[PDB]
């Protein structure tokens, strides 16, 4: 069996930036106390993973990426009370340690045991658990789901419904709950409002889907990629516009189109020009601009503070404001109850081994979410 | 009767920037329809006035400044349904025109009729009601209270309580409502939270009072002027901090002092560095930072969007988010119902003819609020 023994499996390792992943044999150490070893069943490719490949989000290399996933618990360490082997689970990229300031504060979810802020590349106890060619391989956001087995801290893992379709539900681990919560919990979109959503990746489209579930009267979807429009529209966008069609700055276009700005604007791309245009496009006295895309390392925005004095709210959030371990369970329950559908987001299913082809699909505007099967 | 004819009186006219005010004889035209001519009983000197003298807030010159005030209604023009001659009045620097998007929206207050954003120095119909030496003099924020008589549009004037100390209550026209409102209505300070306030002028200490009124467990008051601390402590600040006493940046000191950051920070000064230190000292995952001070003409902050992505909110607000015409009276009522005391703030009362003396007191930290009487 495997419980308590090292596991040897395939995993896609990123040895260098801007280089392909290498499906390698790696040894995965057993769970220490309060840790869980999971067997990956399905994983989604998310833009945050692509940012590490591209050089925009620095994390310690070599690394096993991946964080949007669903799997079955193979073994649990001592102390682990929340998980039992055989339990279906979604690994959370933001832990909910339950004992820090942020975790106790009912409205905050960026727990202090996270590894996004200043990435160590390890698990919470400071150590790694993957070895490939004798060398230690670093973890990513403490989840590293781009491997057939991974070890995750207990506070970073959620037990979900035993009947959950893991090849659909893995989206709720990052992309969907991020997009949808951005609208429903972060910006708190109001019925009848006008919302703009910049970027239509699987997180951008769940933001559209969150604005529609909130009662937004209008949802303008912005993207330089026309092919995304049909899905946006099907999911709730009232209109879709492409910045390259206009001769004047996209915030001016939208201000003119909405009687001086939207009420709620969402940036789900991660570029500075669109984070600025997304601030600008919202109404000067009643707009909320929510930052969802992750910015390129060390870059800055020069804003005039007056943009804010008149009444604008600029905020950002991680995971759609969901406290990870309590939220992702309930959102799967909702999923089961048929409250929403993830099917339009999943455009491709590839075997794990075809991971690089999955990143090529993202890079070409051909895929919204690619799911990788183990 | 004064009515229907051009009044000639005294007004402190600013002819050039960084120049002493000239107390001069000007002609205040009669009210057109939907306008009101008011006799100034008391005027507070507020930081926004000073910025026009400094050159920090550009506005068409010559101009008669002033916007913090209480007076009695001399004549009302035609169609004026809300105030009658003799009615006690506080002119509002931000109108509540009742009909625009911002006015119909229950949460916003920067009515579109405002003359703050792109100041044209006239009343809402695009014309001035003041003359001096065969020259039209401009208005400031459609209020121009540094004149014995001023004409203001109707939507920009509130009928306050018939029995109100007009020498006290005029602070509610700007400073008290802005500072207090910023805390209670914009930041929405929570019971038991910890707030930091940068700048302890008239607006600043009213923010200290608002946080205390909101139930903040800790209120740290920051000011390079050590003499304001006694008042701050008296008004609610649990601690006072002078940036010059340190060797490390004030955010670092405050982050350290407050377990990672303050829950609510208010910048009530208007400098870029303090807007920055104000963003930085509130907790990255749950702090709200509120901009209240007014920024120098065309100066930008280079910020890193990761500062918001972790979860902190950044918002500005005009008038402490009070709908003006509806708000200032309810507060005058609260003052009248013994809810708070403006006394600590009214530091000096001078005859209006000493207005340049009043600005010198401000320019030396002697004064918190100087009231100019008529
Ligand atoms: N805040 C978080 O919690 C959180 C969570 C998950 C993902 N993210 C971030 O969300 C962002 C996107 O996520 P995704 O997985 O949905 O990625 P994605 O690649 O599928 O979506 C990006 C979309 O933006 C569009 N786009 C690119 N340039 C554009 C431009 N100049 N103008 C308009 N649109 C443009 C692209 O066509 C693409 O459709 C990434 O930056 C990711 O890092 C953040
Ligand atoms: N948003 C609005 O609705 C609104 C309304 C009223 C006033 N304001 C703005 O509020 C700001 C000030 O209000 P005020 O009327 O009380 O003026 P004020 O001059 O009396 O008070 C400003 C305080 O800032 C302190 N200070 C100065 N430099 C400092 C520094 N470098 N670091 C820390 N503290 C410093 C000064 O000692 C003073 O105590 C002004 O910028 C005014 O324009 C805005
Ligand atoms: Cl004129
Ligand atoms: Zn993600
Ligand atoms: Zn925590
Ligand atoms: Zn209005
Ligand atoms: Zn003022």
From Swiss-Prot, chains A, B:
Keywords: Acetylation, Cytoplasm, Lipid metabolism, Metal-binding, NAD, Oxidoreductase, Phosphoprotein, Zinc. GO terms for biological process: retinoic acid metabolic process; retinoid metabolic process; retinol metabolic process. It is an enzyme of class 1 (oxidoreductase). It catalyses: all-trans-retinol + NAD(+) = all-trans-retinal + NADH + H(+); all-trans-4-hydroxyretinol + NAD(+) = all-trans-4-hydroxyretinal + NADH + H(+); all-trans-4-oxoretinol + NAD(+) = all-trans-4-oxoretinal + NADH + H(+). Pfam families: ADH_N (PF08240), ADH_zinc_N (PF00107). Changing residue 369 to C: In beta-3/Indianapolis; allele ADH1B*3; decreased NAD(H) binding. There are 7 different ADH's isozymes in human: three belongs to class-I: alpha, beta, and gamma, one to class-II: pi, one to class-III: chi, one to class-IV: ADH7 and one to class-V: ADH6. This is All-trans-retinol dehydrogenase [NAD(+)] ADH1B. It comes from Homo sapiens (Human). The gene is ADH1B.
